[PDB]
Amino acid sequence: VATVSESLLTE
Amino acid sequence: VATVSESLLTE
Amino acid sequence: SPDMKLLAGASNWVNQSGSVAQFVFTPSPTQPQTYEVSGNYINNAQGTGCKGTPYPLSGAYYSGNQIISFSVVWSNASANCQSATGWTGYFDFSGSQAVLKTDWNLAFYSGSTPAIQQGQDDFMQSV
Amino acid sequence: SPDMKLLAGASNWVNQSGSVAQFVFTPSPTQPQTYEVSGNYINNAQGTGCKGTPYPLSGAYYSGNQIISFSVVWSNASANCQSATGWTGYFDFSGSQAVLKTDWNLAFYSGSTPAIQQGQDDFMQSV
């Protein structure tokens, strides 16, 4: 259940 | 007795 | 000499975005004047993912002229940003207070396209 | 998936200058899909110091999209070049053979002046 972002810079 | 260079790029 | 304090225990270093690197140094068994860097990084930069929770960091440090290189993978139990950053630079002890000056690379994907973005971070110690 | 072999045992990766990174991966205890990178780097680039002997490397690897960041301090029992390199990049498994594509930063001193030099290294596996 970690929140997944496309990249560090795209939340 | 390690050989010392000014930097990686300057032997 | 100027890193005598840095090499004793943990220290916290804060960059221009308010993110915090906590460093611990352990001597290398084979590399003269060299240390393994461990600790954690907390990203507090607004407009990013993976904020406010610690991510392990690791790297290496050379005491002879106070140069460092360390990395973070942006995956932990709280948040995964599917990317990694490597910082490389030096502690400038010439001024009134120490400043860690680094260049960084961020590897990430945008859709199916890999990218490496460059930037710079300067950190000052929080004591 | 594409890194199944990479994650089993040691592998040797050779860049355009003939330098060799030997990587070993160990799972992180807390970071999902993340590995500690260990191993050694041998610099074989003509016109440099610190050639032909292993320097420990360390870093971190993210398996979800095969991104890596690792560092070397150029000090060992044979030679000291008083500097450090950090590589950050990605394994491109889209072609006929894998290529590790990296950007690097080299921190060093020229006299009393610190510097950070950027470059790029592409590595292919020696099997």
Q: Which chains touch B (3 or more CB pairs under 8 A)?
A: D
Please indicate whether, in this complex, the C-beta atoms of B2 and D82 are within 8 angstroms of each other: no
Q: Provide the CA D32 distance to its chain's centre, in angstroms.
A: 22
Residues 1-11 of B with CB under 8 A from D: 2-11
* Unique residue bearing structure tokens 């990049």: D89
CA distances (Å), D56 to each of C50, D49, D63, D125, in order? 30, 16, 22, 19
Q: Are D40 and D13 in contact (CB under 8 A)?
A: no
Q: Are A6 and C114 in contact (CB under 8 A)?
A: no
Q: Are C32 and D77 in contact (CB under 8 A)?
A: yes
Q: What does the alpha-carbon distance between residue D25 and residue D3 come to, in Å, rounded to a whole number?
A: 11
Q: What does the alpha-carbon distance between residue A3 and residue C52 come to, in Å, rounded to a whole number?
A: 13
Resolution in A: 1.2
The answer to whether the annotation marks C40 as part of a ligand binding site is: no
Q: What does the alpha-carbon distance between residue C85 and residue C63 come to, in Å, rounded to a whole number?
A: 23
Q: Is C83 on the interface with A (CB under 8 A)?
A: yes
| Residue C62: HSE in the Cβ half-sphere, 13 Å Cα cutoff | 29
Residues 11-70 of D with CB under 8 A from C: 28, 30-34, 36, 55-56, 58-62, 64-65, 67-70
Q: Which residue of D has its CA nearest to C111?
A: D65
Q: What does the alpha-carbon distance between residue B9 and residue D81 come to, in Å, rounded to a whole number?
A: 8
Provide the residue ranges of all domains of chain D, joining segments of one domain with +: 1-127
Q: What does the alpha-carbon distance between residue C10 and residue C34 come to, in Å, rounded to a whole number?
A: 17
Q: If DSSP states are collapsed to H, E and C, what string results for chain D?
A: CCCCCCCCCCEEEEECCCCEEEEEEEECCCCCCEEEEEEEEECCCCCCCCCCCEEEEEEEEECCCCEEEEEEEEECCCEEEEEEEEEEEEEECCCCCCEEEEEEEEEEEECCEEEEEEEEEEEEEEC
Q: Give chain D's radius of gyration (CA, Å).
A: 15
Residues 101-120 of C with CB under 8 A from D: 101-109, 114, 116, 118
Nearest to D48 among B3, B4, B11 (CB): B11
For D1-127, the fitting CATH number among 2.60.40.420, 1.20.1250.20, 3.90.1210.10, 2.40.128.30 is: 2.40.128.30
| Residue A4: HSE in the Cβ half-sphere, 13 Å Cα cutoff | 6
Buried b (16+ CB within 10 A) or exposed e, D49-65: bbbeebbbbbbbbbbbb
Residue D71 carries which side chain, given as an amino acid letter?
A: S
Please indicate whether, in this complex, the C-beta atoms of D69 and C114 are within 8 angstroms of each other: no
User: CB C53: neighbour CB atoms within 10 A?
Assistant: 14
